[PDB]
Every structure is written in structure tokens, then in C-alpha cells.
Amino acid sequence: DAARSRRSQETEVLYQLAHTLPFARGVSAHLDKASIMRLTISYLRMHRLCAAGEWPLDACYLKALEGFVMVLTAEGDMAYLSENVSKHLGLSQLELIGHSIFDFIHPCDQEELQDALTLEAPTERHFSLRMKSTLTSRGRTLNLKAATWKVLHCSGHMRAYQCLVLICEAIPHPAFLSRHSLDMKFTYCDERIAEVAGYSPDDLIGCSAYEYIHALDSDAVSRSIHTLLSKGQAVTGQYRFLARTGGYLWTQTQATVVSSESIICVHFLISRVEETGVVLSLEQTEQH
Amino acid sequence: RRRRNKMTAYITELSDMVPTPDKLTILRMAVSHMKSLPSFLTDQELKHLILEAADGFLFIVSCETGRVVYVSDSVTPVLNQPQSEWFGSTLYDQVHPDDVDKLREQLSTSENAMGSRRSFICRMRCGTSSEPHFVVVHCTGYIKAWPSKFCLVAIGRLQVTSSPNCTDMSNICQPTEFISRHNIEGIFTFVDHRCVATVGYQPQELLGKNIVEFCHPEDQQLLRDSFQQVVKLKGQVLSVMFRFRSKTREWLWMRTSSFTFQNPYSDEIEYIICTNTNV
Ligand SMILES: CCCCCCCC/C=C\CCCCCCCC(=O)NCCO
């Protein structure tokens, strides 16, 4: 019967350990022994990692970002997640640090993640991911097993000192809009296209959007659309959109599948019409 | 007892992680080492993590004039610009002149003021040897009163997505190839200006005409067979070499590598994309 006396000793000192964790007064009491342990393990590992770094306004940085920071190990272990992850997935860092990323991402994105764990510079990473999120328009209203898939654009670097540190941002669900069918044929486009590119919105309806991108970008756009069609949301790189009488403009696009199903695209102009004297496509030539 | 195979694994892990025994003693020393060292990480650690993940820099500018209130050292490894050029200037001194209106609208606090968020792309001056060179910077931040007092606290990052094929140039001299798009009948529906250097035709002299109109007759069958291949090969690339009719150098040997662009949804053929290279 001294066995359970020692057992009470052990978990008294594990609750002690809980009180030693870097969380608020009272947060201890919503934990279980397993999560207490896990959080301690990961606090020590993140302290060991930060100790390897060779080094007032510091708190602006996380405040300046939109998404959250994530540190993934070589074995896909979520080594670190910032607090604001709760604002993007509902799941707080209290319930995520230490667990494996493959337990929280869509099964058809795990290959892409692992390829990322092994035009671009050798060690820069850009990939789209679908993570579990318990958030709705009312807050954290979903229990974990009815969690939905949230698309995150994650960009970061592979740093071995061995990690992959990412900024993971959400794509907002819908100023300048365009609406397409799943074949990307224009069903609607913002009236501001005339002062931006030269096209009347009525002249674009029915036309295929792929005819209006520079060929040098097609591949890229293509890939993005595939993501848009397989994950529900996507964001492109910078690409060239052909103006009416000639030339092109640099732009970026976020895209969301809605609803039977349509595509909504939010476009951000990066530059104004370049090379307006130059005709590139057959349509520019006729309208010239 | 899957519950404490993981707890025994947990305690062994903890033992390995502490710089120093049975379960209670290793967890009692864990406690002490925890008191050796309120958020998970410090703001300094998180700043360095963010800068390890993002090729970016923090800047605080006045909302009314754009005056640079603060800029971090990260701006020089990012923008190739010393803090000499940012301090004492405005954000408008650093951006492309065509981005000034957009930046001014991002800096206005007439609808969204304290605490509100900002998200925008612009082009900033990098360090130039000569005549400014501009790079695309993604800016995200928030409006904050500065103890005529509203300011934007933002981070500007490069390489947020993959870089585009700006040029397609694989040399430093006169272009060797050009990209074209064609319909299913072979009609030029897109061509980039490098065609002027490779075959001597202006883009409008090619658009509307068929590619076979520029191919040597003795080669035409071969060109047509290859094209009928790629519309059947649905995405795969096939190369053909034929005598293109130039405008001044007679018959130029030309390698055209083609593939059909498949609609990612309907799998219909949008067009055929060709890379036409002087062999
Ligand atoms: C994966 C989906 C990507 C779509 C690929 C093709 C899109 C072409 C459709 C539409 C292109 C329209 C570009 C609109 C320019 C307006 C820019 C503007 O002034 N915006 C507000 C200020 O920034």
C-alpha cells in the first residue's frame, strides 16, 4: 500500500511540474498528466533550439503577421506553434505543440508535406496545406471530430541547427472581384477592369481566363487552379494579365470555390500596363 | 495501458531532455530544472523565429505623411539598402511612383483606425549600383497610436510565393527562342516579342496565320504529324525540327517543343503551347 503512496507523490510532483509551465495562473487545472508531460517536453526542446540561435519592439513582429508561425521537425513533429494559431484553427497551442502534423492535415496533402520536408532557392519552401480547424463564423463551435479543413498558404525555410519554420496564412473567404465557372470562364468581373486593363466587363463574360494570362505564367497558374480545384482555395504567384489593346499588367490572385459550384477571385494589381505598344495575342491585335 | 506506455515513453523523453533514476525522481528533477529557466517563447525568440521563416523586415511609418518612424536592420539583408536610406525619409521615398496612391489609401485612417489591419503589395527600391531597381514586397501590419499620432506598424516580406518566369532568358545575348500559343487548327494566338529577334517577324505578322505557313513544304507533313501527336498526347511534350521561313535569313532550322494545355477542370484543350528555338 506504499505503492499508491509513492504514486500520489509522483503525480503531486507532476502537478508541480504543471505549475512550472509558461502558461497563465489557472491554466494548469484544465490539463491532464499526458498533456502536462507533452508540453514540458516541447518547452524543453524549443528552449534547446532557441539556445542555438546566436543572439521592446519585439512583440510587434507576431502582431504584424497575419498567419501563425509553425516549426516542424524532420519527422513531421509540430515543434512549435504561436498563440494566434487559435485565431486561425480554433485549436490552441496548448493542444497542438508536441503532436504530429500528420494527425491534423488532410490525408492527400501528406505527400506534399513530406516532399517539402526533404525559380526557387534550394531551401525556400512554398506549399498549400489543409489543416483541421474547429472554427466557424461563431467561433470555436466544432468539436474536433467534426472539424473542417482550412487551407493555409505556408511559406518558410528549412533551417538545420534540423527544422522547417513556416509562416502559415489563411486565404480570406470573399474589392476587385471576378467570378468564374469551374472551367474558369468569366461569369462576372469588376467594372474597374476598364481603367486597369481596358476591357468592358461584358466583353469578358463567356471568355476563358486562360486566354488572358501570359504564356510564361501558364504552368504556374495551371498548378494554382489545380490546388483551387482540389483544396477549395488557392493563391497564385505574380503573373501577367493581358490588357485589351496590348501589353500586360502584373497581378496576384486569391481564389475560393463557393456553393452548382463557382469560383471567386480577388485580384491585387502589382504594376500598371507594361509594354502597351506591344501586341501579344490575337485578341489584342483585333482590338488594336 | 496504452495510456502509460506513452507515459513511460514521456518520462524517458523527459529524462533525456533534462541535463542531469526512477520516474518520480526524474520528474522531481524536471520540476527543479523547470524552475532553472508568461508565454511559451519570449518576444525576442519569436522575433528571431519569424525572421528565420520570413525574408522580411519590420517598419513603422507615420500614417499621415509616410515618414519612417522606425526600420529594423533586416531591411539591408532583405532590400540591399542601409538604414541610412530609410531613416529620415518617408515610405513614399522607397516605393515605386505608381504605388504612391495605393500606399496613401492604405495609410488613411478615415474608415479603419486604431487596431485595424492592413494588407497590400507594393514595389520598393533595392540597393542599385547605377537608376532605381524595384522589388515586390508584401506588406502586412496594423494601425497604432504613436506616443498626428497614427502609424502603420508593418512587416514587409519578399518571396512570399514562387517567383515568376519574368523573362524566360537563358543567355545574355540576342534571344534564341520564343513562346507561342496556337489553337487546334495551328493558328498563332499568342507570341512574345522575342520572335522579332529569332525569325524577324513582328508579333502581328505571326498572329492570325498558321504555323505551317512558315514551315518548309518538304518538312510540312512532319510538322503536321507532330502536332496531331500532341493533341493526342494530352499534356506530354513532343519536339519537332523543321525549316522555318524567316524574313531575312531564308530557311532557319527550328526546334518546336509543344504540348497541349489541358483545362484543369473540364480537361478540354485550351491551346497548344510551343517553345520555338533556333537550332
Ligand atoms: C488560380 C486562379 C487565378 C486566376 C488566373 C486567371 C485570372 C484571370 C482572371 C481575372 C484577371 C483579372 C485581374 C483583375 C485586375 C484588377 C486589379 C486591381 O486593380 N485590384 C484592386 C487593387 O489592387
Of B11, B153, B164, the CB nearest to A237: B164
Do residues A163 and A79 touch, judged by C-beta distance below 8 A?
Answer: yes
Length of chain A: 288
Ligand 1 pocket, residue A265 CB under 6 Å? yes
Ligand 1 pocket, residue A42 CB under 6 Å? no
Is B5 within a domain? Answer: no
**Rg of chain B, C-alpha, whole Å:** 30
Ligand 1 pocket, residue A218 CB under 6 Å? no
Q: Are residues B205 and B140 in the same domain?
A: no
Fold of the domain built from segment(s) A177-287:
Beta-Lactamase (3.30.450)
Grid cell for residue B199? 525569325
Classify residue A103 as exposed, middle or buried by CB count within 10 Å of its CB (0-12, 13-18, 19+): exposed
Amino acid, res. B64: E
Amino acid, res. B62: S
Grid cell for residue B82? 542601409
Instruction: State the smallest CA–CA distance between residue A147 and chain B in angstroms.
Output: 24
Is B132 within a domain? Answer: yes
Please provide residue A181's backbone torsions phi and psi, each rounded to the nearest 5 degrees: -80, 175
Q: Are residues B135 and B184 in the same domain?
A: no
DSSP assignment letter at B250: S
Q: Are residues B212 and B243 in the same domain?
A: yes
Q: Are residues B191 and B257 in the same domain?
A: yes
Centre of ligand 1 from the C-alpha of residue B221, in Å: 41
Do the Cβ atoms of A93 and B40 come within 8 Å? yes
CATH of the domain at B73: 3.30.450.20
Do residues A59 and A43 touch, judged by C-beta distance below 8 A?
Answer: no
Q: Which residue spans of chain A are classified as CATH 3.30.450.20?
A: 2-170, 177-287
Is B265 within a domain? Answer: yes
Task: State which approach was used to obtain the coordinates.
Answer: X-ray
Q: Whose CA is nearest to atom 14 of ligand 1?
A: A267
Is B59 within a domain? Answer: yes
Residue B86 sits in which domain range?
43-158
Classify residue B11 as exposed, middle or buried by CB count within 10 Å of its CB (0-12, 13-18, 19+): buried
Query: Which three-class secondary structure state does DSSP give residue B39?
Result: coil
Ligand 1 pocket, residue A255 CB under 6 Å? yes
Q: Are residues B90 and B147 in the same domain?
A: yes
Domain count across chain B: 2
Q: Are residues B149 and B56 in the same domain?
A: yes
Q: Whose CA is nearest to atom 13 of ligand 1?
A: A267
Q: Are residues B246 and B216 in the same domain?
A: yes
Evaluate whether the domain defined by A2-170 bears CATH number 2.40.50.140.
no
Is B13 within a domain? Answer: no
Do the Cβ atoms of B41 and A80 come within 8 Å? yes
Ligand 1 pocket, residue A158 CB under 6 Å? no
Is B166 within a domain? Answer: no
Q: Are residues B86 and B145 in the same domain?
A: yes
What is the C-alpha separation between A40 and B36, in angstroms, rounded? Answer: 13
Residue B68 CA: distances (Å) to CA of A8, B47, B65, B72, B152: 60, 20, 9, 11, 10
Instruction: State the smallest CA–CA distance between residue A226 and chain B in angstroms.
Output: 6
Could you tell me which chain A residue has the CA closest to the CA of B45? A50
Q: Give DSSP secondary structure letters for B159-181.
A: -SSPPP-SS---SSSS--EEEEE
Is B144 within a domain? Answer: yes
What is the C-alpha separation between B33 and B26, in angstroms, rounded? Answer: 10
Do the Cβ atoms of A10 and B58 come within 8 Å? no
Q: Whose CA is nearest to atom 12 of ligand 1?
A: A267
DSSP assignment letter at A268: E
Q: Are residues B137 and B198 in the same domain?
A: no
Please provide residue A182's backbone torsions phi and psi, each rounded to the nearest 5 degrees: -65, -20
DSSP assignment letter at B142: E
What is the C-alpha separation between A144 and B214, in angstroms, rounded? Answer: 63
Resolution (A): 2.5
Q: Are residues B133 and B198 in the same domain?
A: no
> Among B100, B123, B158, where does a domain finish?
B158
Q: Are residues B198 and B94 in the same domain?
A: no
Contacts of A1 (CB under 8 A, 6+ apart): none
Q: Which long-range contacts (CB under 8 A, 24 or more apart) does A171-176 make?
A: A171/A233, A171/A234, A171/A235, A171/A254, A171/A256, A172/A254, A172/A266, A173/A233, A173/A256, A174/A256, A174/A258, A174/A264, A174/A266, A175/A266, A176/A266, A176/A267, A176/A268, A176/A269
Cα atoms in the Cβ-side hemisphere of radius 13 Å centred on B187: 12
Q: Are residues B193 and B268 in the same domain?
A: yes
Do residues B240 and B253 touch, judged by C-beta distance below 8 A?
Answer: no
